Design a binder for this molecule. Structure first.
Ligand SMILES: CCCCCCCCCCC(CCCCCCCCCC)(CO[C@@H]1O[C@H](CO)[C@@H](O[C@H]2O[C@H](CO)[C@@H](O)[C@H](O)[C@H]2O)[C@H](O)[C@H]1O)CO[C@@H]1O[C@H](CO)[C@@H](O[C@H]2O[C@H](CO)[C@@H](O)[C@H](O)[C@H]2O)[C@H](O)[C@H]1O
Ligand SMILES: CCCCCCCCCCC(CCCCCCCCCC)(CO[C@@H]1O[C@H](CO)[C@@H](O[C@H]2O[C@H](CO)[C@@H](O)[C@H](O)[C@H]2O)[C@H](O)[C@H]1O)CO[C@@H]1O[C@H](CO)[C@@H](O[C@H]2O[C@H](CO)[C@@H](O)[C@H](O)[C@H]2O)[C@H](O)[C@H]1O
Ligand SMILES: CCCCCCCCCCC(CCCCCCCCCC)(CO[C@@H]1O[C@H](CO)[C@@H](O[C@H]2O[C@H](CO)[C@@H](O)[C@H](O)[C@H]2O)[C@H](O)[C@H]1O)CO[C@@H]1O[C@H](CO)[C@@H](O[C@H]2O[C@H](CO)[C@@H](O)[C@H](O)[C@H]2O)[C@H](O)[C@H]1O
Ligand SMILES: Nc1ncnc2c1ncn2[C@@H]1O[C@H](COP(=O)(O)OP(=O)(O)OP(O)(O)=S)[C@@H](O)[C@H]1O
Ligand SMILES: Nc1ncnc2c1ncn2[C@@H]1O[C@H](COP(=O)(O)OP(=O)(O)OP(O)(O)=S)[C@@H](O)[C@H]1O
Ligand SMILES: [Mg+2]
Ligand SMILES: [Mg+2]
Lengths: 270, 264, 270, 264
């Protein structure tokens, strides 16, 4: 119980340091590019264009889903994936790379992955704003149901932060985890409603049941319900919310316990 | 007359593996016999307030391991370190990034160091004036020469005010026109009665600056006492080593290394 | 014409140095892992398992193609993609990262990407041997048509080396190319017969015609013909071979010209 | 009495950008006026065979740029460098990787350096014996102390035999018991009549080792001639600089920096 208290205290006291270091990292990454920080938004747009060309025109010839054009359906569904993928990939190696600089300075070591994640949360917020503006240009306008984002958007950040908090310690102790993460990320990507709805195309007794255990399913469906279908998602899907909250709590507790156990020996393992 | 750092039976051991199979077997098998290297072995010294201590020894003696154990970055295998007051280490290369400019690097390093925003806003102009970079403070650090980068690092690092200070071969930085300012700044720390640990191979600076001397040979502490009584012994041993033939030097090194490596 | 001669001479004289540096890089990359260099083969196997689970059981329920089980069809088709992807991705940043060490030593600067590519060619060869052994275990045994590999396998290496030779100089001069390469790699991956045959599933007038301009199509089809269908591929598809050879020549010439033009100024741009 | 390096009107300019918009405009617009910094300006010196030359100056003078231009790593903006014979540079950190062990690092650095396999196989035992690492030669370099790593780098680098040699603050490495061997090895190069360029801030070593002195101030060559005639002037200027007040030092630095920065 002391682990959770220590990590919580560190984060709630070093919020501002987290934000400042995230901004500095964003500046560092895109230093040599002529366009600068615009690539954080340019790259996801090109990737989304490729994904729509492949999975939108080839498989289904751009047939509308639920009365919404497929382009906007995919746009709302996929606006979150880049943040999760980049955060989980980059923050797993955060402690390994950034320990040397801050080893000899009195530093709260549990906030290293969090600002790595924030450096991508910035681009996610920008992409979400762009997507909302485009959907408004289509003819779909916001309603009172848009206020569910204040609850749904922080959940994605908390999930990514907890997963990264566990995986950073695991990667520091054993270096095979960083190589093993790629297949798991691919599994999470393909077994989700981001690109397709398997109910119409194929059977739903087996494929759909496994999809419900994937948090990306819940996140994408909640965003679509808040932005597109104009409904209260928690009215009929509260059990999924409870299960996801339990998953987040379990991940946070395990990561905090491991980090508190092995922080003083991080020099030997590195 | 109060102790500042108290060290009792500090030991540091590292396991030596030759192939990946040996490491895998050591990790998996519960009880396994493998080679063990003693970086330090049963070091105990008591430091009082206001005492400047210089660490002297040959290459691979174990001075940096002791300094890191005192500074808190490293953890002893056996024993404890009892200290009072905050500890600061002087290292110029820690927080400087080539992509960030000088102004951005000042804020980055001061933030990672542990200072609040309001203090940084006040201390920034003094650092800028002390560094003497000029117009190049706005240019990226990757464009700097080595001396300019070292001067910026020293200017950022000199702002600390700890109870215990650890320095490592950083008494002066830059050309002759800049070393005097660094020497005066370092001496200012001495006049304020702070415990200082100095690790260097320069005997002239050690004689000019230090008060007590700790001699480390082969991971163990040979002698601890006043500078006037200990430094002549180290100088005499260094002079003696030059007169020995190559075979005798090799025999001395082999005898020194035999005790460190053990199987357990 | 002097550019081609210089680059050709450098490579043909520093073959052995290329091999030795490739081995050293392979040793460097996997130093901290407990399993060591086994990950170069473990990772592609897991990725192939995920790809077969998604695109083999979901889309078509593991229906055989051309009388061959889909698992072996995919295995032969996809054994090359990891090499091309990793080589093109990593070798684009070869000169940027490795110039500082060898700047002050008299070094042939045109061989830096080639050993980066060789470090992945090793794993490709291992995977190809494993695939052939598995296909033999199935009940499909080699014939006189397996000797086409001596012509087809070097072509993949030459294509990757030429593309990397151009992209390394382009990335050194302008740093946006390294960010732009990802979408192009995804386009090359999805518009290829590695995972599916669009002729049966959908229309073939439009999708199939574009696929024929993709070199990955030719490489995968040639490997499948040599290993599985037991036929001489060049008998009816010689025009595709000529077009691919022309593409390779064009890429090599352009890369050599650019590298010879801008080698002496590589310090200013870096 | 034959020239070894001949330098005529070597100039090096760098463009100074404050924001990304200025760089983008400079790249796109055909004719654009931007700030230009003169690292070197119209340097011409002729070096004969067997002449040891020491480069002296204050921080940011332009000594490393000249050494890199001579060594071929960098290219002048205007002018040419005419040289005969091969050029080798002494740099210990160039080819050492932490993941690779000492034995692997020897082969890696010697291969990147330009030696054939048969020569490496012969020269390896001499390097191993000279380094004096002992059992730790099989351990990874990341486990080494700083002194041991520097000694290994020096041992690998000392094997070169060029016509022209460039050294940069690497005359001696390690503790007192190891510096003498490095000094003898360096002197052996002097007895073989090779042109040597030495860049350092240590005036004692420059006086002991060098033959001619080149003084660089503000990107230009103040004086070129014998050590006995040039070094006293530099020492006198250094002594004079200490007596000046802070305002006068700032004025001198501003006057020096005014000529370097130009708009064109
Ligand atoms: C494909 C690859 C497959 C795997 C390959 C094999 C991997 C094996 C890794 C083993 C490992 C990782 C655990 C990872 C998380 C666990 C899973 C969680 C999963 C959750 C989803 C678990 O090792 C743990 O080490 C802890 C050390 O604190 C220790 O903790 C407790 O200790 C006290 C009593 O032991 C107790 O009083 C205290 O309170 C606890 O702190 C644990 O008891 C021990 O189990 C770490 O190994 C450790 O490494 C250390 C430094 O190398 C090493 O110590 C060094 O000490 C000296 C230095 O100066 C020197 O002598 C040596 O340098 C070395 O000896 C340890 O000896 C070794 O054990
Ligand atoms: C770079 C671009 C490359 C493009 C490559 C394209 C390959 C993909 C093809 C699309 C695909 C993938 C489904 C996606 C998987 C999602 C879950 C996986 C999750 C994994 C984690 C499903 O295709 C779609 O799905 C359904 C398949 O039936 C069907 O839906 C509805 O149909 C019912 C009508 O009665 C309706 O009653 C019911 O309500 C739905 O079922 C759709 O109409 C169909 O378009 C696979 O389809 C396969 O291919 C063909 C398609 O037709 C099809 O063969 C024939 O079809 C026509 C006779 O139908 C015929 O005219 C074509 O000549 C012929 O081809 C195959 O038999 C099918 O197996
Ligand atoms: C989203 C981003 C969009 C793009 C953003 C804009 C990017 C613009 C990049 C421009 C660029 C890249 C070309 C890339 C490949 C071309 C495409 C191929 C495609 C194939 C699929 C082309 O610039 C080229 O530079 C060459 C330099 O050799 C020059 O070559 C010929 O020069 C001679 C006569 O000019 C001729 O005698 C000789 O024989 C040739 O060598 C060319 O004429 C010139 O076009 C390089 O820019 C160059 O950068 C240099 C160092 O910064 C800079 O020189 C420096 O010189 C001093 C130093 O000491 C100092 O004064 C300054 O530091 C600077 O001045 C150049 O001035 C600048 O031009
Ligand atoms: N991670 C490590 N694993 C094994 N041995 C190590 C490790 N780190 C250091 N050593 C060894 O422990 C001994 C102590 O060396 P250090 O204390 O780091 O250097 P030093 O005593 O300060 O001497 P210098 O710095 O060269 S004057 C040396 O023999 C090192 O090679
Ligand atoms: N890439 C670059 N762009 C712009 N200015 C540069 C660049 N590289 C170096 N400079 C500047 O050019 C001048 C020459 O400095 P150097 O020659 O590298 O250092 P130095 O003259 O050897 O002095 P030291 O090494 O500190 S004793 C300095 O003012 C540098 O800041
Ligand atoms: Mg040390
Ligand atoms: Mg320099």
């Amino acid at each position: 119980m002391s682990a959770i208290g220590t990590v919580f205290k560190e984060h709630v006291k070093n919020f501002y340091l987290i934000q400042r270091l995230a901004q500095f990292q964003v500046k560092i990454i895109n230093h040599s590019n002529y366009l600068g920080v615009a690539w954080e938004l340019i790259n996801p747009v090109m990737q989304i264009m490729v994904y729509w060309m492949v999975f939108g025109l080839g498989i289904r010839s751009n047939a509308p889903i639920h009365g919404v054009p497929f382009v906007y359906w995919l746009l709302v569904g996929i606006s979150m994936w880049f943040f999760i993928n980049q955060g989980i990939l980059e923050g797993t190696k955060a402690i390994t790379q950034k320990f040397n600089q801050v080893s000899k300075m009195n530093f709260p070591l549990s906030i290293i992955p969090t600002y790595i994640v924030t450096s991508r949360f910035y681009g996610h917020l920008g992409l979400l704003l762009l997507v909302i503006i485009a959907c408004m240009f289509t003819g779909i306008y916001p309603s009172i149901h848009i206020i569910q984002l204040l609850i749904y958007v922080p959940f994605c950040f908390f999930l990514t932060a907890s997963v990264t908090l566990l995986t950073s310690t695991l990667g520091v102790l054993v270096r095979d985890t960083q190589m093993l993460m790629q297949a798991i990320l691919r599994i999470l990507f393909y077994f989700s409603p981001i690109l397709w709805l398997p109910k119409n195309h194929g059977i739903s007794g087996l494929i759909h049941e496994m999809m419900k255990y994937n948090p990306v399913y819940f996140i994408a469906e909640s965003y679509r319900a808040a932005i597109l279908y104009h409904e209260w998602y928690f009215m009929d899907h509260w059990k999924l919310m409870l299960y996801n909250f339990g998953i987040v709590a379990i991940f946070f507790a395990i990561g905090a316990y491991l980090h508190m156990k092995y922080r003083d020996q991080f020099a030997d393992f590195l | 007359m109060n102790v500042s750092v108290n060290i009792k039976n500090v030991t540091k051991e590292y396991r030596i593996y030759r192939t990946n199979k040996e490491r895998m077997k050591d990790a998996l098998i519960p009880k396994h016999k493998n080679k063990t290297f003693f970086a330090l072995d049963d070091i105990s010294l008591k430091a009082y307030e206001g005492d400047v201590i210089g660490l002297v020894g040959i290459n691979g003696s174990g001075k940096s391991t002791l300094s890191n154990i005192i500074g808190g970055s490293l953890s002893p295998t056996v024993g404890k370190v009892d200290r009072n007051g905050e500890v600061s280490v002087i290292a110029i290369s820690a927080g400087l990034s080539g992509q960030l400019t000088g102004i951005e690097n000042i804020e980055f390093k001061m933030l990672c160091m542990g200072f609040k925003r309001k203090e940084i806003k006040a201390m920034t102009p003094k650092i800028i004036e002390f560094s003497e970079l000029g117009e190049f403070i706005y240019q990226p650090v990757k464009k700097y020469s080595s001396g300019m980068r070292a001067k910026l690092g020293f200017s950022i690092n000199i702002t600390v005010n700890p109870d215990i200070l650890v320095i490592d071969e950083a008494l002066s930085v830059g050309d002759q026109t800049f070393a005097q300012k660094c020497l005066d700044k370092i001496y200012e720390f001495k006049e304020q009665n702070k415990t200082i640990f100095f690790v260097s191979h320069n005997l002239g600076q050690v004689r000019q600056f230090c008060t007590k001397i700790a001699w480390i040979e082969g991971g163990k502490l040979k002698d601890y006492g006043e500078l006037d009584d200990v430094l002549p012994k180290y100088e005499a041993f260094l002079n003696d080593f030059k007169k020995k033939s190559k075979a005798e030097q090799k025999e001395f090194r082999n005898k020194l290394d035999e005790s460190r490596f053990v199987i357990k």
